Amino acid sequence: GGLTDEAALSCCSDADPSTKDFLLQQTMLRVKDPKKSLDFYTRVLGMTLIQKCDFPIMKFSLYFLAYEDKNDIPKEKDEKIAWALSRKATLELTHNWGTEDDETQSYHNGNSDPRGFGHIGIAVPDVYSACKRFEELGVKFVKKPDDGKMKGLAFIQDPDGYWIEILNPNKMATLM
Amino acid sequence: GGLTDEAALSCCSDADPSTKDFLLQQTMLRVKDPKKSLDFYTRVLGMTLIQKCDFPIMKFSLYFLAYEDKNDIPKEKDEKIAWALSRKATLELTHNWGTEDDETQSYHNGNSDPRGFGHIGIAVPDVYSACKRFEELGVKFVKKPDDGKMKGLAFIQDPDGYWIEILNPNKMATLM
Numbered sequence: 001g002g003l004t005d006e007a008a009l010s011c012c013s014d015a016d017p018s019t020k021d022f023l024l025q026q027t028m029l030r031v032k033d034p035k036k037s038l039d040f041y042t043r044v045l046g047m048t049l050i051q052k053c054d055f056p057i058m059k060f061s062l063y064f065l066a067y068e069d070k071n072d073i074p075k076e077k078d079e080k081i082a083w084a085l086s087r088k089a090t091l092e093l094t095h096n097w098g099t100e101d102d103e104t105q106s107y108h109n110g111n112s113d114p115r116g117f118g119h120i121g122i123a124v125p126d127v128y129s130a131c132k133r134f135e136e137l138g139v140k141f142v143k144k145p146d147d148g149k150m151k152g153l154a155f156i157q158d159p160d161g162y163w164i165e166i167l168n169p170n171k172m173a174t175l176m
Numbered sequence: 177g178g179l180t181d182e183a184a185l186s187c188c189s190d191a192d193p194s195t196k197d198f199l200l201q202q203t204m205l206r207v208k209d210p211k212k213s214l215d216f217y218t219r220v221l222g223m224t225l226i227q228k229c230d231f232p233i234m235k236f237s238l239y240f241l242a243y244e245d246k247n248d249i250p251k252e253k254d255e256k257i258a259w260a261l262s263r264k265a266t267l268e269l270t271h272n273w274g275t276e277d278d279e280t281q282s283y284h285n286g287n288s289d290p291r292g293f294g295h296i297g298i299a300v301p302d303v304y305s306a307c308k309r310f311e312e313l314g315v316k317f318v319k320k321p322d323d324g325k326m327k328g329l330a331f332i333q334d335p336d337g338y339w340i341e342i343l344n345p346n347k348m349a350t351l352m
């Protein structure tokens with residue numbers, strides 16, 4: 001039903017040299033309550049808060065989370081922004097002020113109509129031990145590692161309900 | 177209002193040692209037409225198609241795009257999957273078979289009600305030269321670099337309408 005491998009490659013062009021230093025820097029998700037999101041991403045997932053930016057006229061804050069050593073965060077405020085925003089693979093959480101206190105408000109995770117965004121995914125050394133720890137911490141699951149046909153791969157959800165895939169790259173090929 | 181820097185830090189925890197090797201591997205977006213999406217991400221953005229996986233019973237294809245040298249892609253199939261799925265900062269595009277032929281179908285970019293996911297962002301050496309080339313290539317813009325308040329920061333759109341931030345970490349706007 002889909003493209004063949006050769007048809008897909010027929011649509012691919014070699015990377016133009018003007019793009020050689022481009023990097024996929026961030027994925028932005030809006031979060032209802034930053035206190036709950038910061039606790040989940042740092043305590044449960046082990047990410048580090050590398051930069052916090054506040055925009056008082058726009059009435060929002062940005063929280064940059066990444067798998068980085070906090071000791072690599074520069075001291076100078078200008079060098080800190082240039083370093084945080086040049087890290088690959090960051091998660092940018094947007095807090096629109098006041099959502100945490102609004103009962104009628106909630107964000108949409110993209111996995112039910114209207115669909116679009118699906119998930120972020122974390123590569124781990126051991127899906128089963130990571131998931132046993134998530135169960136112990138009361139994390140909500142979308143798919144446990146041994147549920148469904150795709151055994152050894154899981155999906156959990158964050159406080160806003162966004163999906164997070166948990167995968168071990170060294171054990172994926174046997175699923176084909 | 178927003179959180180203070182100290183209040184945000186109090187919500188954070190140091191990383192449990194069992195998460196020390198976790199990495200943010202992928203961001204998944206559903207795409208209506210893989211031919212259009214592959215052309216955009218490779219020719220316009222300069223990403224490389226590092227892995228394509230087809231699931232005949234799930235009725236979908238997965239395309240993994242990343243800023244990687246095509247010469248680093250392994251030759252053998254199982255080695256290829258383990259390498260592609262262990263790269264940081266990949267973009268996973270999901271093609272649910274048949275959407276390209278459904279005139280009434282379209283994905284939602286998360287930027288209009290109901291909101292959630294907002295965008296991916298690419299860090300570039302210079303926003304102006306990057307955007308000059310995007311203009312020459314007929315890319316659709318949400319925000320040109322000098323439109324509105326924040327200068328030197330742009331937002332473009334992919335073929336499904338997902339927003340893509342174009343930023344230069346060395347030339348970000350001054351924070352209040």
Ligand SMILES: COCCCn1ccc2cc(-c3cc(-c4ccccc4)cc(=O)n3O)cnc21
Pocket residue numbers: 121142143148150153155165172173175176202229238257268
């Ligand atoms: C509970 O509903 C969850 C969504 C449906 N669903 C179930 C399993 C599954 C795996 C992949 C999947 C497979 C793979 C994969 C598997 C084997 C080899 C190579 C890639 C990579 C990947 O990123 N993803 O997301 C994608 N959707 C999946």
Ligand SMILES: COCCCn1ccc2cc(-c3cc(-c4ccccc4)cc(=O)n3O)cnc21
Pocket residue numbers: 026053062081092297318319326329331341348349350351
């Ligand atoms: C087209 O409407 C888009 C939504 C509203 N909007 C306008 C400008 C703008 C910049 C950032 C922004 C600023 C920054 C930033 C700016 C200065 C210092 C540090 C971070 C990082 C970042 O990832 N983003 O997304 C986020 N939303 C922004």
Ligand SMILES: [Zn+2]
Pocket residue numbers: 026028092295297341
């Ligand atoms: Zn952003």
Ligand SMILES: [Zn+2]
Pocket residue numbers: 119121165202204268
């Ligand atoms: Zn995935």
